[PDB]
Amino acid sequence: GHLEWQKIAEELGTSRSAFQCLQKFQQHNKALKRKEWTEEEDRMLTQLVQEMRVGSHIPYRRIVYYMEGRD
DNA sequence: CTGCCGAAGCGAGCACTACTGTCACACCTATTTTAAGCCCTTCAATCAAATCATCTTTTGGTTAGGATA
């Protein structure tokens, strides 16, 4: 279940650590680095944008704090 | 016509802050030579703090890779 990464690393058999395995997985994870979108992400993104936008300026990469799975 | 002696208030002895004449011995430096320690200048050799140049990491934003709604 993408979980208990110490056991994943031990079972992988290449002497990796849990943190290395997790880092490699997340950098190549479809579920994290989305190409699609979801309803709650769009709704909350619009909410933060409308709250904090002034004219043509918006917090592009700071909204990443609230929704999961972006840079 | 001049002259003596009392009443009261004064008094004493005991209680199982610096000058000045001298005077010779003190002070004073002419030079010799070491063996380890010296103060201050004075610039030159060396180092590290500060600055500037440029590459890189993340926001704004676009291109066109990539996408929803």
From Swiss-Prot:
It is found in: Nucleus. It comes from the Eukaryota. Residues 32-71 form the Myb-like domain. Residues 5-29 bind DNA. It is linked to Neurodevelopmental disorder with motor regression, progressive spastic paraplegia, and oromotor dysfunction: An autosomal recessive disorder characterized by delayed motor development and developmental regression after the first year of life, followed by progressive spasticity with gait alterations, paraparesis, and oromotor dysfunction. Most individuals have cerebral, cerebellar, or basal ganglia volume loss. Part of the SNAPc complex composed of 5 subunits: SNAPC1, SNAPC2, SNAPC3, SNAPC4 and SNAPC5. SNAPC4 interacts with SNAPC1, SNAPC2, SNAPC5, BRF2 and TBP. Part of the SNAPc complex required for the transcription of both RNA polymerase II and III small-nuclear RNA genes. Binds to the proximal sequence element (PSE), a non-TATA-box basal promoter element common to these 2 types of genes. Recruits TBP and BRF2 to the U6 snRNA TATA box. This is snRNA-activating protein complex subunit 4. It comes from Homo sapiens. The lineage of its organism: Eukaryota, Metazoa, Chordata, Craniata, Vertebrata. The chain holds residues 313 to 383 of 1469 of the full protein.
